[PDB]
Symmetry: C3
Subunit: 403 residues, 3 copies
C-alpha cells in the first residue's frame, strides 16, 4: 500500500556520547567531567577527566573488556559492556570517592542478558537490560530492587533520588517516534511520578539527549533542537525552554547539549558545524546559550516581558521541589525570584495602563503579591484611573479573604 509507514525505533544511547564507530569518541560529557574511549585494532583505552581537578585525579583504564557505555558522577565511574560468546554482560563501577580500601566492583548479568543503558544517581546506579529489566544497585555494589520495563529503553538519567527513563511505548508512523517516560523517586518512600506518560516530541524527530538540570529538574532535547523541561508547577507537563536552531545558521549546523543549569540560567552545549556531534580532537569549546520560551510577539515589549516572567517562574520551581523533599535551598534565591517577577508584573501593568487596557491590568494584578496589588491601587489612583483603582481594591479584598 501507499500510506503511513512504521517508523524504525531508535536505538538506546547514553546522553552526552558520540557514536561507537569513531576511533576516538566521547563516552559521556556532563557537568562532572569527560570520559573518552580510544579504540582501534592495537589497543583500547578509556580516559576520565574531571572539570574540577580537586574532585579526583585523571584516571586512565585499559579497556580489556571493551566497555561501550559509561556514566560519570561526583561519586563513581560506571562502565558497562555487552556479552560475548565467552563472557557475560558486565557492570563495572569505579567507586573512587569511597572512604575504604575497596574502590571497585563488577557484576555479571545472567545468561543472554545484555546491558542497554546505565545512569548514576546519588548513591545508586541503574541498568536497563535486553530482558526488559531495570536493575538497581547501590554505589557500593548491593543489588537493590528489580522491575520490568514496559518497552525497550531509549535513554536513562539519574539525579539525587530521581530516575528518568525514556522507552518505546509503541510504534510511530511517518518518521515519528512513540516514546514514553517513567519517572521514579527512589527514596525511602518509593513513588512513580509518571506512569509511562507519552513523551512529547517535535514531529518527525527523535530523542537526542536527556538528563537533569544541575538543580534536579528532568529535561530532554529532540533532534530538531527543541529543549523541553518538566514543569512541576503545571501538573508535571513539559514546557519548551529553548530552540537551538535559532542559534544555527544552516541546516548542517547543530548544537550538542552537555548540561542544563537553572541558576544561573545557561544551556551548556558544543556548537557543531557539519554534523550533530563534535569531534573528540581538538577539544571542543563549550558554548553558553540562553533559554527562551516560545512566546508570541516576543519582539514587542509585552511579549518580551511575558516571556521573561514565565521563564523566571519555571526556572524557580526547583526551589519548591528542594523544599518539599527536605533538600537544602537558599531562601535568598526564592526572594530574588519573587522580586524579579513582581517587577515584571508591575512593568506589564504599567504598559497595559498606557494602552488603556484596564481589564488586562486587573488580570496582571491577580498574579501579584498583596503588597504589589496595594501599590498598583495607588498607581491607579494616580493618572485618574478611578474605576481601575476600584477593581484592584476589590481584588485586594478577595486576596485577603483567601488567607
Amino acid at each position: 500500500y501507499d500510506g503511513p509507514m512504521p517508523t524504525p525505533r531508535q536505538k538506546p544511547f547514553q546522553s552526552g556520547s558520540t557514536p561507537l564507530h569513531l576511533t576516538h569518541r566521547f563516552m559521556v560529557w556532563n557537568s562532572i567531567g569527560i570520559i573518552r574511549c580510544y579504540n582501534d585494532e592495537q589497543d583500547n583505552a578509556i580516559d576520565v577527566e574531571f572539570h574540577d581537578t580537586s574532585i579526583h585525579h585523571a584516571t586512565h583504564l585499559s579497556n580489556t573488556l571493551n566497555y561501550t557505555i559509561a556514566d560519570l558522577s561526583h561519586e563513581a565511574i560506571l562502565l558497562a559492556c555487552e556479552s560475548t560468546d565467552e563472557l557475560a554482560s558486565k557492570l563495572h563501577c569505579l567507586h573512587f570517592s569511597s572512604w575504604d580500601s575497596s574502590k571497585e566492583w563488577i557484576i555479571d548479568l545472567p545468561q543472554n542478558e545484555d546491558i542497554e543503558a546505565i545512569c548514576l544517581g546519588q548513591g545508586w546506579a541503574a541498568a536497563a537490560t535486553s530482558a526488559l529489566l531495570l536493575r538497581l544497585f547501590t554505589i557500593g555494589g548491593v543489588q537493590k530492587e528489580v522491575f520490568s520495563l514496559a518497552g525497550p529503553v531509549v535513554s536513562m538519567a539519574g539525579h539525587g533520588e530521581q530516575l528518568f527513563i525514556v522507552y518505546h511505548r509503541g510504534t510511530g508512523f511517518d518518521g515519528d517516534q512513540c516514546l514514553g517516560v517513567q519517572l521514579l523517586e527512589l527514596g525511602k518512600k518509593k513513588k512513580q511520578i509518571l506512569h509511562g506518560d507519552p513523551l512529547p516530541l517535535t514531529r518527525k524527530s527523535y530523542l537526542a539527549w536527556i538528563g537533569f538540570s544541575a538543580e534536579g529538574t528532568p529535561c530532554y532535547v529532540d533532534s530538531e533542537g527543541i529543549v523541553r523541561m518538566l514543569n512541576r508547577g503545571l501538573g508535571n507537563t513539559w514546557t519548551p525552554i529553548c530552540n537551538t536552531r535559532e542559534h544555527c545558521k544552516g541546516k548542517s549546523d547543530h548544537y550538542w547539549v552537555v548540561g542544563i543549569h537553572e541558576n544561573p540560567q545557561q544551556l551548556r552545549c558544543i556548537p557543531c558545524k557539519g554534523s550533530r556531534f563534535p569531534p573528540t580532537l581538538p577539544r571542543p569549546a563549550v558554548a553558553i546559550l540562553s533559554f527562551k520560551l516560545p512566546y508570541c510577539q516576543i519582539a514587542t515589549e509585552k511579549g518580551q516581558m511575558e516571556e521573561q516572567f514565565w521563564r523566571s517562574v519555571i526556572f524557580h520551581n526547583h526551589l519548591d521541589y528542594l523544599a518539599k523533599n527536605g533538600y537544602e535551598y537558599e531562601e535568598s534565591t526564592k526572594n530574588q525570584a519573587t522580586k524579579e517577577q513582581q517587577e515584571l508584573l508591575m512593568k506589564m501593568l504599567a504598559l497595559s495602563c498606557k494602552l488603556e487596557r484596564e481589564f488586562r491590568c486587573v488580570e496582571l494584578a491577580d498574579l501579584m503579591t498583596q503588597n504589589a496589588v496595594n501599590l498598583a491601587i495607588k498607581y491607579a489612583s494616580r493618572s485618574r484611573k478611578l474605576i481601575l483603582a476600584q477593581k484592584l481594591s476589590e481584588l485586594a479584598v478577595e486576596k485577603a479573604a483567601e488567607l
Copy 2:
C-alpha cells in the same frame, strides 16, 4: 500484505461546527449562542447570535482575515485563522463583556505555526498549534503558560478552570482511532487530572463532539451516537449516558449534539435526516433527548429502576465537584437527589422481597441511608421475613460502627 491497515488520523475540529466547504456554515453552536460564517467569492461575513438577548447584542463582523475557527462564551468571542504566505496565524478575541474601553485584542503566532484548535474557559483561552504546543491566554490578552502536546490535537473544550484536550496518542487499525485525553485544572493549584488516558470509543468510530455539561462535567460523543460522560464517582472512568441511534429510524439519520445538561437532565441536539450535520438555513430546531444508561433488561421493573438509580447517581456527582472546589451549589438539589435514590432503592428492595430474593434485599440496603435501612427492618418484620429482618439489623449495626 492482507491484514490490519493503519487508520488515517481524523483532523482537528471545533465541536458544534459544520464543515468548512459549506458556503453558509456553523462555526460553533453551544449553550451560549450561535456563530455563523457566510463565505463565497464576493464577501466573507461572520454573524454572532446569543440565545439570551440580554447577554449581548447581535454582532456582525467582516471576516477579512478569513477566520475558520470560532468559540463563544458569556465573556468573549474567540476567532482564529491559519497563516498565509504573507500573514501569520492569528488568535482574535472580542472581549465584549469587558468593563473597559478596549474590547478587542489579536496576537500573531510565530513563523510556520498554525492554530489547529481553540476553546474558551472562565477568564482564559487556549489554542493548540501545529507545533504541538498549547498556549494559554487570559481573556484580556495576557500570555500564560505554554506546554507541549503528546500528539496532534483532535478537539479542545473548556469550562471554569478545566481544560479538556483530546489528541492522537497513537495509530489505530481497521477503522479505529487511537485517542488520548489530557484533562487539566488551571486554578491557582495546577493539576493534571488525566495524564493522557486512552479515550474509549465505539469500534470503527471517530470523535464527533466533546465539551462539558452546563454543570461542568466532561462529555463526548463518537460517530456511532454513543454519548459518554466522566464518572467522577467511579475513579474518573467514562460511562455511556445515551445512545442517539435509539432515536434514529434509519442509517442516514443522525443527531448533532449542541449541549448537555445534568439538572434538569436533557441532551440538546439537532435531528439530521440524510447527513450528520444540519444545514444552516432554515434555522434547525433543537430537540431534547433523554439520557439512558445501557443497562440490561431495561424493559423489566428491576432493570428500569436500576437504570434510573445509577443515572441519578452519576448526574449528581457534579454537586460534590462544585463543593470540593468551593463553587456554589444548591443544597436542596443534593437532598432531592438522595431522596430520589432512596425511593428507588426502597422500591427495588420491595420488588426483591416479592421475588423471595432476600439476599438481594440486603445488598440493596447496603446502598441505603441509616434511616432507610431502619425502615426496611420494620418492613421485613412485616410480612414475616424474620431472617431478612435480622440480616438488615446486623447491617444497620455495621453502618453505625462505620461512623
Copy 3:
C-alpha cells in the same frame, strides 16, 4: 514492504482454562476448585468440584445454553455464553452460598452485545462485553455501575474489592502485544489505581494467565514462563518473581499456572509435557514451584542472600495493604518478616566486612532497624574496624533524628 508487521491481537480468555475445541476441557482451575465442561454432539455437561469438600457439594449442570466462560469462588459459580440468532448473551450465577431460598439468577445482555470475559470478586461480579463495556453486578444479581473500556479485553480477574483488567491499548509489531492494565478498587471509595498503564511482557510473548495471589496481590504470567507481581512498595511497578522455564527440560515443556500464594511462598502449577495446557483426563497433579527473583550472580553467597532479602520484602507488602484497607492480618507474620530480613542484612554485612568492603556495610546498615544498626556497631568495634564503627554510629544518629 519488508519491515515490521502488525502483531495479531490475542483473543480474550479465562485464566485457568483449556481451549474450547477440546471435548473435555477445563473452564477454570483456581484455588477454590475445578470446573470442567464435557461437550460433544450428544450432550453438554458442566461439572463443578471444590478442593475443600466442606465448602459445597459437587455440582453437575446440564449445559443447555452452551456456556463457554466460567469462574468459581467461595461464594458462587459464574457462567456466561455468547448470543445466538435466537438467544442473547447471558450471564448466569449459581449463588450456592446464599442464605435464602433463591440461589440462582440470570440476565440477558442487550441486542448484539456478547460477553467476552468474566471474573468474580468478594460479593460482586464483572463482565467485559463486545460493546467495550464493563458491567458490574452484585453477587445477588443487582446491576451496579457501568463504564467503557479503552480497548478489547484480554483477561479479567477479581479479588476482594480489586478489579484487574488487561486489554489491548494498541497494536504491537514483530510478535509483540500492546497490552494495558486497568486496576480498580470498588469499595465505598472508588479508586482507579492504574489508569491503563502499559503491561510489561517478555518480547514476542503473549499473556497466558492473570489473577491475584491468595493474599490479594495482582500477578500475571506471559507465554515465556515469566511470572510478574505488582510491587506495591515500588510505586506499583511489576517485578518478576519466577521463571518457569528454569524448571523445564525442553522447548515443548511448559507449566500451567493454577494459583499463587505468598505465605507460605508457593507457585501452584501443572507440569505439561508436549503442550502448554494439561489434558483433562487423567487428573493432573499440582506441582509446587519456588519463587526466584532474577538477580545477578545468584550462585554466590552475596547474590543468594540479596535475592532472599528482596523476595522476602516483596512477598510481605501485602501485609501493609491489608492494614491500610482495614483488612485482617497477623501481626506475627509482620514480625517474622522483619526478623528474617534483619538476619539476611546482618549476614550480608558480615560478608562485606570479610571482603574488606566497609562502605558496602554502611549501605546494608541503612536498610537495618535501629537495634540492628546498634548491634552492627559493636560488631564493627570487634575485629578492629574502627572507621566502619564510626560511620555506623553516625548512621545510627541520623536514624534517631528521622523520628
